[PDB]
Amino acid sequence: YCAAFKAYDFFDPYPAFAVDSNNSLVYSYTLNFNDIADAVFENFNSQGYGWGVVGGQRSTNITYRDCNLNRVDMHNPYMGYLKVLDTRLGTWGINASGMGDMYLERVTVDLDDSAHGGHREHEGIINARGDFGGFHDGGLYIKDLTIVGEASAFEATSGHPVALVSAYSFNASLAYIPESSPVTPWGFKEVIVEGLHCPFKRTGRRFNSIISAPSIQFTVYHPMRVKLEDCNFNSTAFEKFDLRGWRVTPYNPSKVGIANTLAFRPTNFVDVKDCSMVGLEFTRPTSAYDYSNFDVNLVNVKNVEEHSLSPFTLYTNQCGRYNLVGCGLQQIVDKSMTSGERANRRSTFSVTGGTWNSLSGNPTDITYGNGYDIPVVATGVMFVGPYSQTEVTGANLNVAEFVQASGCKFLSSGPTYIQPLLWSGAGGPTGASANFNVARGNTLGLNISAVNGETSQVIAATLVIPQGFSTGPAAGTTYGFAVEKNINYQLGLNARSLKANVGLVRCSDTITGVYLNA
Amino acid sequence: YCAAFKAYDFFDPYPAFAVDSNNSLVYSYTLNFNDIADAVFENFNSQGYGWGVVGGQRSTNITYRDCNLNRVDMHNPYMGYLKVLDTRLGTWGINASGMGDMYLERVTVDLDDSAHGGHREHEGIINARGDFGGFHDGGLYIKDLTIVGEASAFEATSGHPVALVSAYSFNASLAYIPESSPVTPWGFKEVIVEGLHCPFKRTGRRFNSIISAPSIQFTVYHPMRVKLEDCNFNSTAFEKFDLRGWRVTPYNPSKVGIANTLAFRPTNFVDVKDCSMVGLEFTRPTSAYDYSNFDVNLVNVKNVEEHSLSPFTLYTNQCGRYNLVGCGLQQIVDKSMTSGERANRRSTFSVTGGTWNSLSGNPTDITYGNGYDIPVVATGVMFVGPYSQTEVTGANLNVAEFVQASGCKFLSSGPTYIQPLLWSGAGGPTGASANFNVARGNTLGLNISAVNGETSQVIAATLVIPQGFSTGPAAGTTYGFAVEKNINYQLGLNARSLKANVGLVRCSDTITGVYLNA
């Protein structure tokens, strides 16, 4: 019951290490407060092994400045604001349920936890309270967060590293939010991270998940908006967004099943800008909880560290709309590596600018519904990979089928640029057999060797695949001087929804090759 | 006449409430100063109803930290810097004419003003002095601003809520800048806002205007550059940029009438990024002051709250260039809802990526000059709305006429995608009448039923509308095997600047439908 005060340089050489009869850690505090308002703590010192040194309850407008503590905690929720400025933290991090906003600025976290066996109450660095339901009805705003240490003792017991943000409940029948309550059970309402620095390299992934809920109680919602900027993870494996333990979103209360991502409103929003990671993965929830619809926006994303390759791959399992602007893309895979499930809904992909370097493989790996009804659209992109102008390679067919391109270039190895070859043979007046799929809207080039009675001429024809308003084939006509005749050609088409299957090549003269005229 | 000092921990339970014989508020101060330099004020407590508790004049390098005051003020301008950090403010906000730079970091504003009888000195939250001409020759930089309360009494007496930033004069004959003065009369030279939080929902619009000049004195210029980032307004109505009441820009001193926004230099710059609002409106000034040319960039703008639908609308009747990247667009309207006027100059619109969901209406509403000479260009956009492939709907014609699209998709309700239908009939050799406009550069698809003496075939043909270098029609030739003849078709064109009016449909065989192949 205190208000309008300030505390100062209390020095504790190391915190208390208290155990029970079974040699298991129990609670102990250096500072413990109830029912305070408008408080400032400055230059507190209690750092090391042991239980968290701070325990607070039911407070308002708390500020920590220039402190050195192994934990900052609030058991009962706070309200107003909670500010942590220029502070060094220990392995516990922050554990606070609240009805306000949390501010973090220039905070260092050290994760070493060897003296504790594998004991860890909450699986993340910034947490809500697991014995209060895991709710935080407010935003979280972070500037210039630094991570050191590894927390290897916890990993040996559990098998994975710690998460960044966690919000879940230990037992839904003991800690939850009742229906009549006026509290909205957001995990966190908003998460804004602006600048994450990891000075030391990590073999594996930096975090188990960006936002985590590793229980099966389903008490709180996934955050409505997540934004990451200038985050350098400095790791050798992809980071992931795990959405497998969250309550059904309040944007879809009637639980309407979604068939196409554009036929329903977006429920969650994610923005990643100028971040450095090897890859990103989205894993959908299990059935009876899979009712979300994401809206993902990626801008200038690649890997900048020299210990790995530059292009990044995007794994996705969840229905949503994906937009990429100026990224160093490698591959788009419509499955989750963690679980293995392919996909069950139609999504949308749009790529603008940048480089698409697939290294040694195909640009895409999409199999849901054989890939029909999945619109991958690219504009002004430079494609690098195993393409060829003289042989029909796997990457040639993959890009012409799954990607609709306009104003794009292709380069395998050499100093110059090439046109991928899709078919080779002799398409005479009777027709030659063919079997390859091409996305509608792409432009194909035909190399034709026309001959009159005595003279001959090489013809370069250009053909556009119709969009699917008709069941007719793709045909055209052109003229050639020095032969004094018209050249007529036609490709037979079979309907494949968004794509078309070419089954017969026919021309009045001989067609020798079909190319992707990007 | 003081310098190099600091003041701490003054506590005032509530400010003075002083009136006059007519029961109206008069001035009273807790802290008053003039001619000071290098001052720090920390942990000052004076919060509540009454006149603002700080009055300052002619100072340099002032800092407020961890304070709780109902106003921060400077009557005579300051110089150097003015810093407000980690401070809670009352309904008065900040009023300061300046010859320096203003910084704000982690500031909360409470807007409740019930005890005052709807009386406000200035109409915004951050204001320049109205009795000094309303100038601030310098920049304004804000980080993490929080708004609570409503200020309902002022709205009741005046009809609209407060603005965010205000700069104007009460009387041009008493408070102004003479022509021989070396002061540049900027309202604010630059405005940067990064992070605006409004935890409580508002029915209506959060602010009357972002930058406001609600007088008719015309003493100061509109800000040259305005930037908004990560601002969640949390309201159910559109926000607006009101450009009435500002002195004519110094970039156009001869007052040259602009005609096409590309034949004159830009004069003002606006950038909005990762913000959340239902809509945005630009209102042009009245004649004798309408000589500006705006450059607007919108990146990833949509509504994320659960109560107001996602897609956002853009209203504008001001001359300028508009670029939208990865936005959740709903409609583009070339009018101002506040005033009702439509437009008088030619503007430019460019859309890249994202979704264009028009719900149950048309994607565009453009009327100035019948829409000719207004180049709306789209690339890689997913169009959602009331489109059809078996009927000619209004949205089909609207999107075919007003938008030049390339690599775009259309979806109304179903899991699959459609091609909008523009015309139905029987286009034989004589020709069938038609009346519909289409922007030049769009690609059209024709479904042709070709019949020879005994055989028949369905033909799919694509056609590109010429750009206007010539006056001829759009024609083409294709071939059909199994009928052993060529098919010739032609669309008669009537010139409408950037668009073309189709008047006649002609074909040697029968044309049954014309579609938008885009």
DSSP element (H, E) containing B105: strand B88-110
Chain B CB contacts of A40 below 8 Å: 66
Q: What is the DSSP letter of A375?
A: -
**A378: nearest CA in chain B?**
B380
Do residue A469 and residue B413 have CB atoms under 8 angstroms apart?
no
Beta bridge pairs of residue A232: A276
How close B413 comes to chain A (CA, Å)?
6
CA distance linking residue A47 with residue A337, whole number of Å:
39
CA distance linking residue B165 with residue A372, whole number of Å:
52
CA distance linking residue B74 with residue B129, whole number of Å:
8
Q: How many CB atoms lie within 10 A of CB B467?
A: 10
Chain B CB contacts of A250 below 8 Å: 306
Question: Which amino acid appears at position A431 of this protein?
Answer: G
Nearest to A348 by CA among A314, A388, A320, A327: A320
Q: Which residues contact residue A420 at a Cβ distance below 8 angstroms, ignoring those fewer than 6 apart? A: A387, A388, A389, A393, A395, A396, A399, A400, A410, A515, A516
> CA quadruple A463, A468, A469, A475: dihedral positive or negative?
positive
SS3 at position A396: helix
CA distance linking residue B505 with residue B518, whole number of Å:
20
Nearest to A347 by CA among A255, A262, A224: A262
Nearest to B195 by CA among A82, A78, A275, A140: A140
CB B322 within 8 A of CB B271: no
* Chain A interface mutation, best of B300, B377, B446, highest count of A Cβ atoms under 10 Å: B300
Do residue A506 and residue B481 have CB atoms under 8 angstroms apart?
yes
Chain A CB contacts of B323 below 8 Å: none
Do residue A467 and residue B406 have CB atoms under 8 angstroms apart?
no
Do residue A263 and residue B413 have CB atoms under 8 angstroms apart?
yes
CB A210 within 8 A of CB A226: yes
Residue that is written with structure tokens 């926006």 in the block: A297
**A463: nearest CA in chain B?**
B462
Torsion of CA A194, A198, A203, A206, to 10 degrees: -40
Beta bridge pairs of residue B364: B332
DSSP element (H, E) containing A398: helix A394-402
Do residue B66 and residue A348 have CB atoms under 8 angstroms apart?
no
CB A111 within 8 A of CB A148: yes
CA distance linking residue A292 with residue A258, whole number of Å:
9
Q: How far is CA A203 from CA A109, A196, A233, in A?
A: 19, 18, 11
The partner residue sitting opposite A139, judged by closest CB among B197, B302, B414, is: B197
CA distance linking residue A234 with residue A243, whole number of Å:
23
Do residue A477 and residue B480 have CB atoms under 8 angstroms apart?
no
Question: Which amino acid appears at position A278 of this protein?
Answer: V
Q: What is the DSSP letter of A256?
A: P
Count of A-B CB contacts under 8 Å? 148
CB B487 within 8 A of CB B470: no
Residue B216: Cβ-neighbour burial (10 angstroms; 0-12, 13-18, 19+): exposed
Q: How many CB atoms lie within 10 A of CB A22?
A: 5
Residue B9: Cβ-neighbour burial (10 angstroms; 0-12, 13-18, 19+): exposed
Chain A CB contacts of B68 below 8 Å: 38
DSSP for B219-263, written as a single string: -SBPPSEEEEEEEB--BSS-EEEE-TT-BPPTT-TT-PPPSSSSS
Q: Indicate the resolution in Å.
A: 2.5
Name the region of A354 (left: φ>0; alpha: ψ -120 to 50; beta: rest): left
**A508: nearest CA in chain B?**
B481
Residue that is written with structure tokens 């002032």 in the block: B62
CA distance linking residue A113 with residue A174, whole number of Å:
29
Do residue B304 and residue A474 have CB atoms under 8 angstroms apart?
no
Q: How many residues does chain B have?
A: 518
CB A105 within 8 A of CB B144: no
The partner residue sitting opposite B445, judged by closest CB among A225, A466, A486, is: A466
Do residue B352 and residue A348 have CB atoms under 8 angstroms apart?
no
Nearest to A196 by CA among A270, A145, A141, A124: A145
Q: Which residues contact residue A38 at a Cβ distance below 8 angstroms, ignoring those fewer than 6 apart? A: A3, A4, A5, A60, A61, B68
Question: Which amino acid appears at position A216 of this protein?
Answer: I
SS3 at position B68: strand
CA distance linking residue A102 with residue A126, whole number of Å:
10
CA distance linking residue A42 with residue B137, whole number of Å:
37
Q: Which token pair is A114?
A: 């060897």
Q: How far is CA B327 from CA A47, A336, B355, in A?
A: 47, 28, 7
SS3 at position A245: coil
Q: Which token pair is A359?
A: 């290294």
CB A323 within 8 A of CB B353: yes
Beta bridge pairs of residue B379: B352, B406
How close A506 comes to chain B (CA, Å)?
9
Q: Which residues contact residue B182 at a Cβ distance below 8 angstroms, ignoring those fewer than 6 apart? A: none
Chain A CB contacts of B462 below 8 Å: 464, 466
Q: Which token pair is A173?
A: 């029948």
Question: Which amino acid appears at position A188 of this protein?
Answer: F
Resolved by: cryo-EM
Residue that is written with structure tokens 């407020």 in the block: B64
Do residue B479 and residue A477 have CB atoms under 8 angstroms apart?
yes
Alpha helices by DSSP H, B364-461: 394-402
The partner residue sitting opposite B353, judged by closest CB among A350, A468, A486, is: A350
Residue that is written with structure tokens 């909205």 in the block: A184
Q: Which residues contact residue A450 at a Cβ distance below 8 angstroms, ignoring those fewer than 6 apart? A: A456, A457, A458, A459, A480, A483, A485, A487, A509, A510
Do residue A262 and residue B411 have CB atoms under 8 angstroms apart?
yes
Chain B CB contacts of A323 below 8 Å: 326, 353-354
The partner residue sitting opposite B460, judged by closest CB among A269, A325, A472, is: A472
Do residue B481 and residue A490 have CB atoms under 8 angstroms apart?
yes
Do residue B447 and residue A441 have CB atoms under 8 angstroms apart?
no
Q: Which residues contact residue B426 at a Cβ distance below 8 angstroms, ignoring those fewer than 6 apart? A: B432, B510, B511, B512
Q: Which token pair is A181?
A: 């309550």
How close B275 comes to chain A (CA, Å)?
12
How close A286 comes to chain B (CA, Å)?
22
